[PDB]
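The passage that follows is intended for readers who have already worked through the single-chain material. We present the inputs for a multi-component assembly, then the predicted structure in tokenized form, and finally a short commentary. You are encouraged to pause after the input and sketch how you expect the pieces to fit together before reading on.
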Amino acid sequence: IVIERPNVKWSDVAGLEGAKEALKEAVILPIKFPHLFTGKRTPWRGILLFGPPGTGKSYLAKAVATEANNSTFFSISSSSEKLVKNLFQLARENKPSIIFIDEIDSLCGSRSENESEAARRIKTEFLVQMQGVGVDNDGILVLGATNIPWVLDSAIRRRFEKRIYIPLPEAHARAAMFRLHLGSTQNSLTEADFQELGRKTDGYSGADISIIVRDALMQPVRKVQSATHFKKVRGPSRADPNCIVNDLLTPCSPGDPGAIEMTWMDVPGDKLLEPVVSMWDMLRSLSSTKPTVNEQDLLKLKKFTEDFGQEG
Ligand SMILES: Nc1ncnc2c1ncn2[C@@H]1O[C@H](COP(=O)(O)OP(=O)(O)OP(=O)(O)O)[C@@H](O)[C@H]1O
Ligand SMILES: [Mg+2]
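Having made your guess, compare it with the prediction:
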């Protein structure tokens, strides 16, 4: 029940400007401009974010959480669980409010057979609470997320009249993720290198790239741990960036001029000048990781919208 609002700006989510606008139109505008969405224009009660894994579903929700300017956010995932009655209640008071249930395929499991019988009233204590005997004409909106939506209950599914597809990133959005997940960190990557990576990642999810950048990111760290030699160098003081020093120590090879023998244990905590993440490190991280979303996965996703499409 994370009742908070993290730090994910729209700017942080690459691509998805379609879903962004969809979400601005059904979640932010209604809250900021009540009088617009009154009468016949009442925002749907439930939005569902479906689409392949690692394409932005949960992440997007966080963006909404922070960009949900006035309303307070509420979250849950795959986590005696009758205090669902408690959640909805909580929200009605702090209305306007948003309720986000990540992987709503949590509260479900059908091959058309497989049930934990007490979770049958879980489905129903939720299903019922969305109708509301005390009609919650509050700014209360229910968000859902899932990468296997077809497994949902007709009753549940049809509870989300607005359904948005979160796809695999187009090339442009791909390059932008590498850039971002790197950020304020020291590196030697050119705008050209980002495009080259974007181009080389045909078919990858956001989660996949997120893994790649984290790996390459860790390169200077592996090189410092494993090094056997360090050179004395010029660079920004660890304590004061705008004071250069002729003193830092960076890892190197023995076949290097100015190579002192020692390990990181010998380097003072405040004299290490770490290596920069290079494009070499990206491609290396890249080669050793392959796309997670296969075709049949994406195919079965076309199915879920086969006339299920909107509302039913
Ligand atoms: N559109 C995006 N913009 C920026 N980063 C992204 C994007 N999509 C995925 N990511 C990366 O992956 C992570 C978010 O993964 P996300 O929550 O979207 O996976 P998911 O969609 O919930 O997976 P699943 O669908 O299986 O539940 C972030 O840490 C981020 O680095
Ligand atoms: Mg998720």
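Commentary: The chain has two domains: 1-168+292-309, 169-291. The pocket of magnesium ion (ligand 2) is lined by residues 57-58, 102-103, 145 (CB under 6 Å). How closely did your sketch match?
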